[PDB]
């Protein structure tokens, strides 16, 4: 095939112009729709606290207030789901990869709307989970739909504007470019066979996003934590062994999440008013004890820099890994919309803290900050359980803005990767996109 | 299909431990070997440095002992070249590219020596050349290398250990580990079919490669600029006006380059003795200018915070700029062992420094500092050249540290990438791969 | 340059206290962990203990509960020691140094001058 | 806590000619440093990590040295080398110095 590569070579790298451009505007939509629904459940999680206020008073009608407020919430965002675009339910990246693959349909008149109200209705009520699920299906709608209004033809535009628009929604979403394309590179692309994908558009995209997200956003950041300490040589085994514990947590927080899709799925047996019903405690569950133990819930950004501070007793660590880990599982796995991916953050910072806690008192020789683990950790559930390292250690670089903690990044993130891998735990994206296909067949 | 996917699917990220391992010490081998290169490079322009010395008197037996300890050390490197692996001449990773097309043999018995003791004596002699032509080659070659020692079977082994050792390679020039895994996502993998290259395995080595580099660099950095200030969204059309113009100088300078090797050719006819002479005169030059303008000549990265600072003049800048552009093809045109990337780098920072410089003045209500643009153009050369953009981005926020200009080092970035193509220009690298198998089959 | 210059010592009765100073100039004071030791005539360093940057962590030698006490003041760019219930055994060279590693087994990197401690009556 | 003993407590040694001090640790200990003190004079970080000069310590000077053994040297003594010269472990926590090798000129 010498002389098919000779010309193959001499023409690499010429993304036709519509493409480039259309990357242009896929972009331009998802930054702005992710920055408006970002706004939204801003605004709604406010309307929650001074309700609170009017009813400070009566502890119980307060404890009241909080329940209702975000039960209703929720409930609205399951319904919405449920009525008008059940393929909404749950993060939506697994749905987005199945469209890169050509086994899943993009149903952008559809899913748009019900995403982002429905979204909206989720986070907005202060459940746990991470807006890059919707900006990503919503980001790959977006791609479907500009697609489909300037009916531009071709495995390329359709393969390339899809994948723009996730990469442009995860970029928006934790104002991280690079993890946006990243992402895609590594995760979101068909992953056993050659692909059309124009990287080129995909950066034009993420870039279009980000300018967006800046426009509304400037001089604030998600995730300030600071200059941490560097990292001496003689210090990085214990990174790895902390790889180590993440690589076999991974594959087991996995099978939790999936067995309580199951578990809770058995609960309403699939009938809307049941489901909806029950969406509605778990939202209510969540904007009490926002009150209560906000810790315990929401997004979990809050406690981040918190944790990485070492501010936290041991004590309460654990309380919050415990109880996240809880909160996780009933809020994804029930099927709402909204990702698992930020929640997970959150839990790799707590658990890399207690991690460095302990350095901290055995080797008083290595000069340790708990914050150094914590910031190793953050990125290390998203290794261990999603599969995709480079682009949570990309992700971590990113937010936190650490380059010295490189190489312990790496080392934490690869040791996860390896260990989830040897204790034969699945990519979870990956293995909610096949256990829907699955079902898409048995029934005949 | 939907059978085959769901199986697929399930069976994701199942790379054989034998890989996984072998993928560690592959890694292992070439940051000790990227070290020990590195150490020989600089070992050999200090005892240039002590012999300028002993003669420092004598104005023009100071010149003459500069242009001949450095013609001399070029012309065994040219020869090393030509007599034992003509392929290990140039940069290398066209050639690494290659293997990893199944286009072009791993010599390692043979390019390992050749290019490790040829790369001292054009790189020690204070060539404008860099580090990670070698360090890729050689670190390919070591990635088959210990694919035959242990007789490992299969395309996946094959390709695998083959992309590990030429990322642990970059990473080991740099210390960059994350531009290293990108160089082989983005650049040298097959770039059109899929491959079995595994990413898991290539991580692993470049690990371990970067490991090695701390163990003997720790405490000082390559490139050392500081914290610069922010950049202003309504400052950012400036970047994308940069890119611009990297955009249109990067196709012209592949042209240059590659029609400077035709040039060169034509020198001497391909004769292994007119070609070590002419190695020499090139390779004395060199060590000359690296007396009387140290600027013109060199790797160039001892010039780049320099110029970052803003303490060049604009005078200067062009000067250098100029200069380093002809002695950057003289010397990889020449056919020298040695990358293009890192003086590609300096090429960057150089122009962005002078654009900075205009923007400065043209618009003081911006309030701009002229390194923030020299950032940017670090890696617009190499987006615009080798069309490695993102690797290029990734490489320079590695070396330089400023996070805060994430977004107008991408616009200018883009805009490079996006200018050369739309210019009819091509990827360097893929350039001279086509045209070493254009000559294997004429 | 890099300059510490510590001060605070002369004599003090026993069962006195006192309070040394050390003045960093010519490096990011912030950053480093800062350290004392002390030298009694004619004999060995001793190590007192160390301070992180956030003051988050102090360390001690094996010794006495409120003996010493080790804190510092990033934004006046000063390290300071505290000896109470002083005995002859604290008639020292004291000093004052920035510490860093190599590989990661810490080490003494820039000491300064020093000052005396006399504890006599 | 770990204890390190300096040998030739005190030492002569003809300039020109070939000084050697011992450090050793009452349990196994890593990457040691070495300080000279002139007196009058704030300790100078000499050599580290067991074996690295620091920044203008003449080559003459080189350490050596694994587990409970370790020892400077002076390849050509120098007259300005007339200094106190004590080594420090932190391999082990808490970190404790040597007692010391004094080092004078013969003549």
């Known amino acids: 095939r010498r002389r098919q590569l000779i010309r193959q070579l001499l023409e690499r790298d010429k993304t036709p112009l519509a493409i480039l451009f259309m990357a242009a505007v896929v972009g331009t939509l998802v930054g702005l729709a992710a920055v408006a629904f970002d706004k939204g459940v801003a605004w709604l999680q406010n309307q929650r606290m001074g309700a609170l206020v009017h009813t400070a008073d009566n502890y119980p009608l307060l404890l009241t207030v909080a329940f209702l407020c975000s039960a209703v919430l929720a409930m609205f965002g399951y319904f919405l789901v449920r009525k008008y675009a059940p393929e909404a339910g749950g993060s939506g990246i697994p749905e987005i990869e199945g469209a890169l693959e050509d086994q899943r349909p993009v149903r952008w008149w559809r899913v748009l709307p019900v995403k982002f109200f429905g979204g909206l209705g989720t986070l907005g009520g202060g459940m746990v989970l991470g807006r890059e699920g919707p900006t990503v299906q919503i980001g790959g709608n977006i791609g479907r739909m500009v697609l489909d209004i300037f009916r531009l033809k071709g495995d390329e535009a359709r393969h390339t504007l899809l994948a723009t628009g996730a990469a442009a929604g995860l970029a928006a979403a934790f104002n991280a470019p690079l993890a946006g394309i990243l992402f895609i590179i590594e995760e979101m692309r068909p992953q056993f066979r050659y692909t059309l994908i124009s990287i080129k558009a995909v950066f034009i995209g993420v870039i279009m996003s980000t300018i967006m997200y800046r426009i509304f956003n400037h001089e604030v950041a998600l995730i300030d934590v600071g200059k941490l300490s560097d990292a001496p040589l003689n210090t990085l085994w214990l990174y790895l062994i902390l790889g180590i514990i993440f690589g076999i947590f991974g594959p087991i927080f996995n099978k939790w999440v999936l067995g309580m899709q199951d578990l809770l799925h058995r609960v309403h047996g699939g009938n809307i008013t049941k489901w909806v019903l029950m969406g509605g405690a778990i939202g209510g569950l969540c904007g009490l004890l926002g009150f209560v133990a906000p810790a315990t819930s929401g997004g979990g950004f809050n406690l981040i820099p918190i944790a990485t501070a070492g501010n936290f007793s041991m004590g309460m660590l654990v309380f919050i890994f415990v109880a996240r880990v809880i909160t996780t599982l009933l809020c994804f796995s029930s099927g709402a919309p909204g990702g698992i991916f930020a929640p997970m953050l959150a839990l790799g910072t707590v658990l890399g803290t207690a991690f460095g806690m302990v350095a901290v008192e055995l080797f008083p020789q290595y000069h340790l900050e708990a914050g150094t683990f914590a910031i190793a950790g953050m990125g290390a559930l998203l290794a261990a359980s999603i599969r995709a390292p480079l682009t949570g250690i990309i992700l971590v670089l990113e937010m936190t803005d650490n380059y010295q903690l490189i190489l312990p990044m790496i080392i934490t993130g690869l040791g996860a990767t390896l260990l989830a891998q040897f204790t034969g735990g699945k990519p979870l994206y990956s293995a909610i996109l096949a256990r829907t296909l699955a079902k898409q067949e048995a029934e005949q | 299909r939907r059978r085959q996917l769901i199986r697929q699917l399930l069976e994701r990220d199942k790379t054989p431990l034998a890989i996984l391992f072998m993928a560690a010490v592959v890694g292992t081998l070439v940051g000790l070997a990227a070290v020990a290169f590195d150490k020989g490079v600089a070992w050999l322009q200090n005892q240039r440095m002590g012999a300028l010395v002993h003669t420092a008197d004598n104005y023009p037996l100071l010149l003459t002992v500069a242009f001949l300890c450095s013609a001399v050390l070029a012309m065994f490197g040219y020869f090393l070249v030509r007599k034992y692996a003509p392929e290990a001449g140039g940069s290398g990773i066209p050639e690494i590219e290659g293997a990893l097309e199944d286009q072009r043999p791993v010599r390692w018995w043979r390019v390992l020596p050749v290019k490790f003791f040829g790369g001292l004596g054009t790189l020690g002699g204070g060539m404008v050349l860099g580090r990670e032509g070698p360090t890729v080659q050689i670190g390919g070659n070591i990635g088959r290398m210990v694919l035959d020692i242990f007789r490992l079977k299969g395309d996946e082994a094959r390709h695998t250990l083959l992309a590990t050792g030429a990322a642990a390679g970059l990473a080991a020039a740099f210390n960059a580990p994350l531009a290293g895994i990108l160089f082989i996502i983005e650049e040298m993998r097959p770039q059109f079919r899929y491959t079995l290259i595994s990413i898991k395995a290539v991580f692993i080595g470049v690990i371990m490669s970067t490991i090695m580099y701390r163990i003997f660099n720790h405490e000082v950095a390559l490139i050392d600029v500081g914290k610069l200030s922010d950049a202003p969204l309504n400052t950012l059309w400036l970047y994308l006006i940069l890119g611009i113009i990297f955009g249109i100088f990067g196709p012209i300078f592949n042209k240059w380059v590659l029609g400077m090797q035709d040039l060169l050719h034509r020198v001497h006819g391909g004769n292994i003795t007119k070609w070590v002479l002419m190695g020499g005169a090139i390779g004395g030059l060199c060590g000359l200018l690296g007396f009387v303008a140290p600027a013109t000549s060199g790797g160039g990265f001892n010039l780049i915070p320099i110029a970052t600072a803003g303490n060049f003049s604009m005078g200067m800048l062009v000067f250098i700029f100029v200069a380093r552009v002809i002695t950057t093809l003289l010397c990889f045109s020449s056919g020298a062992p040695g990358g293009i990337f890192a003086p590609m780098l300096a090429l960057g920072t150089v122009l962005g420094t002078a654009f900075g410089m205009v923007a400065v003045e043209l618009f003081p209500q911006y309030h701009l500092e002229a390194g923030t643009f020299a950032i940017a153009g670090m890696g617009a050369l190499l987006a615009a050249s080798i069309r490695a953009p993102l690797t290029g981005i990734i490489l320079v926020l590695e070396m330089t540290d400023n996070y805060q200009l994430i977004l107008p080092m991408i616009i200018t970035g883009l805009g490079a990438t996006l200018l050369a193509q739309f210019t009819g220009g091509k990827p360097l690298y893929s350039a001279i791969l086509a045209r070493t198998l254009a000559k294997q089959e004429a | 340059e890099v300059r510490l210059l510590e001060s605070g010592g002369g004599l003090v009765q026993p069962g006195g206290s006192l309070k040394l100073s050390c003045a960093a100039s010519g490096f990011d004071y912030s950053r480093y962990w800062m350290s004392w030791v002390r030298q009694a005539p004619g004999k060995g360093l001793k190590w007192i203990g160390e301070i992180n940057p956030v003051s988050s962590t102090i360390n001690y030698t094996p010794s006495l509960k409120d003996k010493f006490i080790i804190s510092r003041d990033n934004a006046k760019d000063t390290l300071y020691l505290q000896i109470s219930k002083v005995r002859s055994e604290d008639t020292a060279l004291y000093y004052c140094?920035?510490?860093?590693?190599?590989?990661?087994?810490?080490?003494?990197?820039?000491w300064g001058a020093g000052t005396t401690v006399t504890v006599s009556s | 806590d770990i204890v390190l003993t300096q040998s030739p407590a005190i030492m002569s040694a003809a300039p020109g000619d070939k000084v050697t001090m011992t450090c050793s640790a009452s349990?196994?200990?890593?990457?040691i440093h070495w300080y000279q003190q002139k007196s009058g004079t704030s300790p100078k970080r000499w050599i580290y990590?067991?074996?690295k000069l620091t920044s203008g310590v003449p080559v003459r000077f080189s350490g050596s040295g694994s587990g409970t053994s370790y020892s400077l040297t002076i390849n050509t003594m120098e007259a300005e080398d007339a200094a106190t010269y004590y080594c420090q472990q932190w391999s082990s926590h808490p970190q404790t110095f040597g007692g010391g090798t004094k080092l004078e000129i013969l003549r």
């Open positions: 140094a920035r510490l860093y590693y190599g590989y990661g087994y810490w080490y003494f990197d820039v």
């Open positions: 990590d067991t074996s």
């Open positions: 349990s196994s200990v890593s990457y």
